Amino acid sequence: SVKEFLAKAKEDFLKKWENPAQNTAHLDQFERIKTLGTGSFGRVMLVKHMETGNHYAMKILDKQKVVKLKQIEHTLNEKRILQAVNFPFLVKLEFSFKDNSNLYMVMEYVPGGEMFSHLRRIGRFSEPHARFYAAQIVLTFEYLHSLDLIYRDLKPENLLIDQQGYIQVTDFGFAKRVKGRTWTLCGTPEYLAPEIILSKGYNKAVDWWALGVLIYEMAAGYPPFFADQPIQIYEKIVSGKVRFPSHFSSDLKDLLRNLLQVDLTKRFGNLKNGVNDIKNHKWFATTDWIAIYQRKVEAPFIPKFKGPGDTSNFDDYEEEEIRVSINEKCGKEFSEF
C-alpha cells in the first residue's frame, strides 16, 4: 500500500541524507557538447561521459556567484536532497563534484525538452493531457512531502518530458528539508502562494497551491494570475479572485478552487485527509494512480526523438568558456558539497 511504500522510501532516503555521496566524478571524464539552459549563478550543459558514452545534463554553478546571491545554503540543500531521493518522476543525480571555481551536478539527460516549450507552442493541453501530468506531480509531492521536503518551484519550465512522455522534475534549488514552518521568499511570481507574498511562515501547502497554478496553466494555456510586472501579479494572487475559461469542466474548476484557496484550513493537500482529498476528487476519477506510478498509462504525447544527444527541443544559448581558477574559491562555504 501507499503507507508501506512511503515508510521504506523514508528509510532509503534517510540513509543517504545522513551520509551524502561526495566527489563521485571529475570534469575531465565528460565531453562538453552544448548549453541547454542558463541562470544567474550557472548553466546546464549537455555532456558525454567518455567511459560509458552516456549523455548527461551537467549543472555547473559558479561558487563566487552563488555566494553573492546568498544561495550557499540553498545549493547545499539542492545537492544533499537530490543525491538522497529516488522516485520515477524525479531527475536522477548521477554524479557530483567540485573544483577550484565550480560546483557540478551531473544529472540524467531528458532530450524531450521542458513542458514549458511544448505548452507554449501547442497553446494548451486538453483536460486528459493536463490530468496525466498533474497526476505525476501529485504522487511526486506525496513522496517529497513524506520525507519532510518542500519543493518550492513548481512550473512548466522545471518539468522535463522523457522518451515515454512522462515527467521528470528538476530544479531542486529551493528544495528544503523542514519540519514545521519556513520563511524564505522564493519561487516564481506566478506560482507563489499568498502566504509567501505576505511574508508569513509557510509549509508544504505552498506546493499544493502551486499545483493549482500549474493545472490551470496547462489546461488554460495561460496562468490564473498574470501581468507585465511581478508586483501586479502579487496583487492579483492576494485579491482572493480567480476566473476560469469557458471550456474548463465543472470538476476542474472545483479542484482548482480548492487548490488556489487563500484559506489554509480549506486548501486541498493541507487538510486532515492530506493528499487523499486531491487523489479522490472527481476530476481524478479516471486516474489509475498505481498505473501512473508504474508508467503503464500511455502518454498523450511523446517527444520527437532524433538521437540520444540531439538538442532540438531546447533553445540555443551563447556558449561561454568553463574557467577553472588555479586558486580555490569559497572552500569553507562549500566544504560539504
Partner: peptide, 20 residues
Amino acid sequence: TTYADFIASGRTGRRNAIHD
C-alpha cells in the same frame, strides 16, 4: 480575449525564479 492579453504580455517566455 484573455489569451490575447497573455500573448501580448511580457511574461510568455521562460520565467526566472526569484528570491530575497
